[PDB]
Structure formats: C-alpha cells, structure tokens
Design a binder for this molecule. Structure first.
Ligand SMILES: CCOC(=O)/C=C/c1ccc(O)c(O)c1
Ligand SMILES: CCOC(=O)/C=C/c1ccc(O)c(O)c1
Ligand SMILES: CCOC(=O)/C=C/c1ccc(O)c(O)c1
Ligand SMILES: *[C@@H]1O[C@H](CO)[C@@H](O)[C@H](O)[C@H]1NC(C)=O
Ligand SMILES: [Ca+2]
Ligand SMILES: [Cl-]
Length: 496
C-alpha cells in the first residue's frame, strides 16, 4: 500500500480537481504521458447528493448516495474509458474514496441525487447500496447531538458525525465488505490506488480490515502481486491524541504540516526563513518519508468547512506558489502531489476571503470541458497549474533526479538557498529582498545547462537562462529578487 505503482521514473501525481473523465483521458494522452506525470487523483466517482438550487458546490461530491459510478464528471462507461486510456499510456488513476460516511443527516432541506437513486438521510435509508440504520454509528456515538463536538477528542472524531455526515459503522463486516466491493470494482477496472478521505475520522483497525479485503492490481497492466497505493487523509497538527503513526500500517498518510510550514516559511511568517529548510522532512518532525504524501495546497478550496493549516494563492501569491511547488518537487522527501484547480471569485472579508459557495465550471450541472489555449494553458475557467512551465518542468526534474541523494546544501543565513540532487540536478532559490549572485558547488558535470524555470530545452538549445558548470562542478547563478520566478533549476536532461 506504500508504493505508488507508477511507471519507473514517473514520480508525481496530479489532482485534476473535478475534471470530467473524458478530459482526463485526453489529458493523459496529450500531456501527462509525454511529460512524465505518474498519475492522476480523480474526484469521487461514486453517486452523490445534488442540492436543489442549481448551485453545484464542490462539497456535494463528498456526500455519497450510492457506489454507482455516476457523477457530474461522467458515467461508468466514461470512467472505464479513462482508466483504460490512461493506463495504456502509463498514467495511473487514483480514486478519492469517500468511505467514512454517507450524506448529511439532514440535506433533505432540498435535494436529489446524481444518478436518480433513492435515499432518505432521516431514516438512514440508502437502498442503492444497500445501507440501513443498522449500518451507521448513531448508537455508538456518545455525544448529545450525535455530531463531533470536540475535534481533538479521539473517540468522538471517529464514531460521531463529521459536520453532520451520516457516519458508517465501519466495525461491521457487512459495511466493510460493501466498501471493499466498491473499491474492488474500481481496482478491477484498472485503478492503481486511493486517497482515503477523512481517515482521521476512521479507526486504524477498521481501515485495515477494509484494506485486507482489497484486490491485487489488474495484472494486464500491473505486475502480479501489486497492491493498491493507499494514502490516508489525516490532519495531524501536533498535540492531539490522534496521530499519523496510528495509520502507518495501512499506507501513506497526508502530511498537512508540509504545506502549512512551507507556506509560512516562504511567506516569512514570524521571522521564518528558507534557510531553515536545510533539514526539511523528518528533521522538522514530519512523518517518515516512505509514509508521506506531500503537497503545498495545505487546504485547497479554503471554504468554511476546514479545521487546520491553510494558504490559497493568487498573483504575488502565484509567485510564492510556484516557489513552494518547485522546492517540493526538487526535495526528496515524500511522494508528491500537485493540484490543478479551477477559477472562482473571492469575497475579501472575515479577515482574508469568504466567497465560499464555489463549485467547478459547469454545463448546467455537468462539468464543463477543459479547453486548451494556443500557448498550452487552459481556458473555460480551468487554471491548469500542472501545465505552467515552471511546475511542469519541475515535475520532470523530479523524474530525472529519481533516486539521487539530497546533497550540496547552501544557504546565506536568510532566504537564499540551494541544493543538489546527486549528480543529476541542482536548484537555487532567492526569496530575500535583494539579488542573488554567487558561484556555488553543484554535483553536476561540466557543461551548458538550461534553466527549466525560465525556459525550456528545445532542439539542442535553451529558451531562457543558461547556466555554465565548470570542470569541478561549480556554477554561477544570478537571480534578481524582482524576477517573476526567483529560482533556477537545472538537471541532467536539460544539459546541452
Ligand atoms: C474527442 C474525444 O473523444 C473521446 O475522448 C472519446 C471518449 C469515449 C468515452 C467513452 C466511450 O465509450 C467512447 O466510445 C469514447
Ligand atoms: C523517523 C521516524 O519518524 C516518525 O516516525 C515520525 C512519526 C510522526 C507521527 C505523527 C506526526 O504528526 C508526525 O509529524 C510524525
Ligand atoms: C482549440 C482548443 O480546442 C480544444 O480545447 C478542444 C477541447 C476538447 C475537445 C474534445 C473533447 O471531447 C473535450 O472534452 C475537450
Ligand atoms: C545553444 O545556445 C547556447 C547559448 O545560449 C550555446 O552555449 C550552445 O552551444 C548552443 N547549442 C549548440 C548545440 O550549439
Ligand atoms: Ca467515522
Ligand atoms: Cl488529502
């Protein structure tokens, strides 16, 4: 459950948030496989509630009505077509598995379902699964409301309703088996693994009993004996009784302190500075690298439903976002996930921002198509961060330096830092308020290399900055603090 099951040399996954299955299939063929992306995390593919408004909020997909594969991203035929085409070009599919709960215990304030299945939250009746009142934790939870009242309390966190969502009794083997039936149907179609939603709200032993029922991967594409990659969503910020180490036996765990701290460091909060990232990873008290799923959108779609660290980013903030993603993709700690988002307005109040009824671009309920502009960016309100040159080229950097050690760290005691990845990559960052201009030791061999942040290596030549490495691996780097991207990255495949 710890190995990503990606093709050798492909080292990251991209979350194509709410994209349609057809658009992900095309993206796998025209962009993700040619650019070496390891896989895609898709939004929940199972049937969910549809509020009566239109209003198609993003959170509707986290309220299951059944396990039929029928959502605004597409139906089962479209889902199987996407998994087949993506696996055929070596791009894996990871499903967001919503298994802790069904929909809101109320929600009947006005609602329907995405594939027409009947459901009634009040009587706990979900006949398309089938689940009844005997399959929920209403009698195990001991709070007066039935909802979680203290989110650091270990028993309420796992047995009571998360924000009113009907909580499944995962100690029953019937419930564990229905969930495994759904997840096994997905593995058999060709899925390579899963994001386990709300894992903090499930007991480690119940998750393991579900995982022990999971199938080996489809051996028409994966070697025999391969097991599904599992990454558990658990926000563990520090002193609470629930800890990420309660879940290492089941698979990887999301390290939310990674994106939170990389965000406060790049923003210099409280005097923090990038030179403190010298011992980034386990030196910062994070989970072990072989159990970490890392990302920098600490909390994307930062609406009111969220109890943790958070930082969403715009223009001067897109600059900080690209710097954070580049540091993450060059650093060897953890398995990396990049987020691809959609555009949505903000309100500018409550302290930071509050336009929160966000939902993806939609064609009257169904997700809109992803369009590609002539410069390879996207239209139709999709942001496509994974197509930004600086991010895409850092996804490639991570592949090129796969397995090489962290080495050659440099820092100026403030926010100008640099490090190498063995003899195959080197990266330099300037987040101070003055320019950087110095000769540093790399582990790279002599030659001319293209900076992949400011340009590309096209046809034996570079489109942006060129870096010259001398015979003893030293190289001069000059970075203005006024550059749009104050960092430079070079690697073995961007050498001329
Ligand atoms: C121009 C893009 O067309 C497609 O991507 C075809 C997707 C597709 C999905 C499900 C099917 O059963 C199918 O025949 C085709
Ligand atoms: C080298 C071993 O390090 C660990 O096992 C870290 C465990 C750990 C558990 C929970 C956390 O929230 C965390 O940051 C770290
Ligand atoms: C000139 C740009 O053309 C496009 O962006 C086509 C997007 C597209 C084409 C076919 C599809 O089935 C789809 O989902 C999306
Ligand atoms: C590409 O251009 C750089 C200068 O920008 C030069 O050093 C390099 O030799 C050129 N490539 C070839 C193959 O001549
Ligand atoms: Ca629970
Ligand atoms: Cl997550």
């Amino acid at each position: 459950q710890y190995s990503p099951n990606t093709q050798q040399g492909r080292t990251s996954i991209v979350h194509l948030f709410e994209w349609r299955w057809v658009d992900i299939a095309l993206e796998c063929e025209r962009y993700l496989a040619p650019k070496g992306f390891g896989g895609v995390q898709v939004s929940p593919p199972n049937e969910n509630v549809a509020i009566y408004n239109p209003f198609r909020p993003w959170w509707e997909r986290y309220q299951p009505v059944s396990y039929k594969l029928c959502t605004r991203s597409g139906n089962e035929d479209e889902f199987r077509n996407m998994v087949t085409r993506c696996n055929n070009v070596g791009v894996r599919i990871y499903v967001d598995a919503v298994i802790n709960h069904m929909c809101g215990n109320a929600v009947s304030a006005g609602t329907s379902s995405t594939c027409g299945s009947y459901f009634n939250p009040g009587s706990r009746d979900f006949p398309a699964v089938p689940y009844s009142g005997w399959d929920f934790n209403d009698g195990k939870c001991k709070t007066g409301s039935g909802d979680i009242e203290n989110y650091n309390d270990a028993t309420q966190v796992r047995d009571c309703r998360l924000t009113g969502l009907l909580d499944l009794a995962l100690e029953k083997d019937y419930v564990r088996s229905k969930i495994a039936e759904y997840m096994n149907h997905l593995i058999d179609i060709g899925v390579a693994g899963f994001r386990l939603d709300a894992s903090k709200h499930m007991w480690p032993g119940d998750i393991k009993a579900i995982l022990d029922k999971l199938h080996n991967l489809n051996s028409n594409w994966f070697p025999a004996g391969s097991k599904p990659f599992i990454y558990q969503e658990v926000i563990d910020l520090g002193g609470e009784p629930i800890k990420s180490s309660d879940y290492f036996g089941n698979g990887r765990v999301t390290e939310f302190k990674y994106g939170a701290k990389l965000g406060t460091v790049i923003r210099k909060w409280n005097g923090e500075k990038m030179s403190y990232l010298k011992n980034w990873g386990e030196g910062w008290g994070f989970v072990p690298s072989d159990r970490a799923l890392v990302f920098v959108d600490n909390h994307d779609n930062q609406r009111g439903h969220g109890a943790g660290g958070a930082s969403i980013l715009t223009f001067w903030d897109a600059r900080l976002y690209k710097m954070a993603v580049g540091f993450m993709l060059a650093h060897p700690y953890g398995f990396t996930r990049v987020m691809s988002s959609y555009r949505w307005p903000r309100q500018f109040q409550n302290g930071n921002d509050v336009n929160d009824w966000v939902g993806p671009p939609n064609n009257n309920g169904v997700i809109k198509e992803v369009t590609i502009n002539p410069d390879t960016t996207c239209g139709n309100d999709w942001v496509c961060e994974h197509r930004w040159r600086q991010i895409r080229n850092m996804v490639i950097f991570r592949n090129v330096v796969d397995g090489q050690p962290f080495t050659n760290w440099y820092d100026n005691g403030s926010n100008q830092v640099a490090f190498g990845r063995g003899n195959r990559g080197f990266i330099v960052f300037n987040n101070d308020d003055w320019s950087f201009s110095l000769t540093l030791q790399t582990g790279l061999p002599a030659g001319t290399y293209c900076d992949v942040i400011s340009g590309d290596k096209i046809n034996g030549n570079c489109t942006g900055i060129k870096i010259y490495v001398s015979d003893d691996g030293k190289a001069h780097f000059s970075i203005s603090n006024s550059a749009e991207d104050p960092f430079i990255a070079i690697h073995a495949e961007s050498k001329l």
